[PDB]
Structure 1
Amino acid sequence: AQSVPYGISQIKAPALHSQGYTGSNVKVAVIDSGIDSSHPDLNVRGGASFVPSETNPYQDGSSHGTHVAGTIAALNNSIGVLGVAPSASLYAVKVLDSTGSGQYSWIINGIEWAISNNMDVINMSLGGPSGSTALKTVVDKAVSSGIVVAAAAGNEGSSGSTSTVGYPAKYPSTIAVGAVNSSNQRASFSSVGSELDVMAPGVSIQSTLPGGTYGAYNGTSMATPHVAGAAALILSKHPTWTNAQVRDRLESTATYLGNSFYYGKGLINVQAAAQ
């Protein structure tokens, strides 16, 4: 049978599913380590690899990109798990290799592909303590071109009063996403700062793994796809909403959880964002 991971219900996605909104015709680029396109519980519509050593985007040697994609869009059916937007159009934009690392050049090429191929949403479950001028340029370009960009806040935890948000989540134009558990407690490794925007489930997140299996991971990498999917659910109900509009909904209708330095606006609530 199919299971619904707790995170999916936590952000209220099933309420949208009941209403008939499952992310149909919304194009979501998973900018990551590839996606195992052969996974029975995933439907990958296209893609591109910008990893010179890994020409095939439809395979995932890491598992990270695959697990992220299943949080966004694992298919609604009789097996496995269920995505936030199970009818979303999933694109494999390989910019990380099988070790789960990549170069800013490769990342930028992926985002450039996303723009040229008219994606509605970009998931970047990645980041680092410094950015590059070229990365900010292309991330801002994607935003100004109409794309919702969800980026992982990072897993650097707290450090007194200092921001530990990584790039590209640190940039104003991106949605910076932190991790909570099933009780809405911030996860201890979740990066903090004024640049942190919202929270999503990021602890013990069951999702798809390459080879057609399922497993749980922790991180802001797992939180982030809940927000990417949520953006797809919203757009599938509100096809004329702008990326600015979707962001401001996801943010303003979030469930306040505490001090914004630690929680931003709180836990996303897609039912309330989509109203």
Structure 2
Amino acid sequence: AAQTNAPWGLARISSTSPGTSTYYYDESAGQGSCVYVIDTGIEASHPEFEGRAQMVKTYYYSSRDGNGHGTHCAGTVGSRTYGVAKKTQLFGVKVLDDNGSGQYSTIIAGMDFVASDKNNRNCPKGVVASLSLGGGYSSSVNSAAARLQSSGVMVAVAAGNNNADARNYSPASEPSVCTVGASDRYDRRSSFSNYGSVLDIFGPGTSILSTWIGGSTRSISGTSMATPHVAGLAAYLMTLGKTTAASACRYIADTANKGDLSNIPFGTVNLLAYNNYQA
């Protein structure tokens, strides 16, 4: 399958080369897999989600996304135009209030909620969680991401947009989960991207076009937009039976475009998420 004039990110994850704008993917498109977006919530009613998105949990007064962050990440995972896995089920878990921030205890509860809630969902192809959130190191937050992973969910987490070593952030610094840095359309490390030995993979992070609240669209930049790309790829790869929740991160890193990225610190992996799809 080929989507002409796709967002640069989608085109790049189905490319050996930068500078193309057609997304190539297997038409299965992550059907029968679920990606949990642990975020500000999802505008489920966005025509781009085609009824494939639902809010499953909130820790606030509304489950609505009054922010936009989580609607924009959800979109990069599995929206028809801006998604990697165009046929995946999106579950919205609102751990972040509409100002974009949330207590670590609430975030942990959200990660433990997904680890259980998946047993309440039809995800025969497997379960992915996209964590486009971060803060300071916390073993408790690290251990929550470890538990979600261990439970049989592929956990993808932003490295953080501090342009520092992600060893000092959570859940970015958790060894057992997929830590995602951000690249830009010219194959450069995004100036904001965290780095370090704890990074597993890079994703398109800079100027990521996706869905927004008010049934709208906009471009935004972060490791937070690299993550939904890797989250989605994992959903797509799992639906192809090409990997599992537990080994998805490895698989993605084994099959990644290697040495393609510039401004990658020594001792950080030079690996760009790649669907390795051959039309």
User: Shared topology, TM-score over 0.5?
Assistant: yes
Deviates more, 1:200-209 or 1:254-263: 254-263
Contact 2:166/2:172 (<8 A) preserved: no
Distance 2:58 2:269 in 1: 33
In the other structure, the counterpart of 2:106 is 106
Deviations 1:216-250 (A, max 9, x none): 001110111000000000011007x4323222110
Does 1:173 find its partner at 2:181?
A: no
Q: Which amino acid aligns with 1:68?
A: C
Q: Kindly indicate whether residue 162 of structure 2 is the aligned counterpart of residue 156 of structure 1.
A: yes
**Partner secondary structure for residue 117 of structure 1:** helix
What is the alpha-carbon distance in structure 1 between the residues aligned to residue 209 and residue 74 of structure 2? 12
SS in 2 for 1:229: helix
Letter in 2 for 1:169: A
Inter-partner Cα distance in structure 2 for 1:40 and 1:233: 21
Q: CA contact under 8 A between 1:60 and 1:210: conserved in structure 2?
A: yes
1:9 alignment partner in structure 2: 11
CA contact (8 A) 1:165 1:193 kept: no
Q: Give the 3-state SS of the residue equivalent to 1:138 in structure 2.
A: helix
Q: For each residue in 1:45-77, what CA deviation from the matched residue of structure 2 results, as whole angstroms up to 9, or x when unmatched?
A: 43333323x332xx21111000001101112xx
Cα distance in 2, alignment partners of residues 253 and 203 from structure 1: 22
| Partner of residue 58, structure 2 | 50
Q: Which residue of 2 aligns with 1:266?
A: 271
Letter in 2 for 1:84: V
Q: Which runs of 5+ in 2 are unaligned?
A: 16-22
Change (3 A) 1:127 1:262: farther
RMSD of aligned Cα (Å): 2.2
Contact 1:122 1:147 in 2 (8 A): yes
The percentage of aligned residue pairs carrying the same residue is: 38
Change (3 A) 1:216 1:68: same
Deviates most, 137-146 or 170-179: 137-146
Q: CA deviation at 1:36?
A: 0.5
Partner of 1:227: 230
Matched, 1:136 2:139: no
Q: Could you tell me whether the CA contact under 8 Å between 2:135 and 2:170 is conserved in 1?
A: yes
3-state SS of 2:97 partner:
coil
C-alpha contact 1:46 1:91 (8 A) present in aligned 2: yes
Partner of 1:182: 185
- Alignment partner of 1:63 out of 68, 72, 75: 68
1:181-205 deviations in whole A, cap 9, x for unaligned?
0011001111111111111111111
Cα separation, partners in 2 of 1:36 and 1:262, compared to 1, 3 Å: farther
Tell me the distance in 2 between the aligned counterparts of 1:196 and 1:102. 24
Call closer, same or farther: CA 1:109–1:216 in 2, change over 3 Å: same
Higher mean Cα deviation, 102-111 or 36-45?
A: 36-45
| Unaligned stretches of 5+ residues in structure 1 | 76-80
- How many residue pairs end up in the alignment? 258
Cross-structure match for 2:216? 213
Q: One-letter code of the match for 1:269?
A: Y
Q: Determine which of 41, 44, 60 is the counterpart of 2:48.
A: 41
TM-score (norm 1): 0.87
Instruction: Give, in whole Å, the separation in 1 of the partners of 2:183 and 2:108.
Output: 29
1:49–1:55: 8 Å Cα contact kept in structure 2?
Answer: no
- Indicate the residue corresponding to 1:78 in structure 2: none
Instruction: Give the structure 1 partner of residue 19 of structure 2.
Output: none
Could you give the per-residue CA deviations for residues 65-107 of structure 1, whole angstroms, max 9, x where no partner exists? 00001101112xxxxx331001000001000000100011211
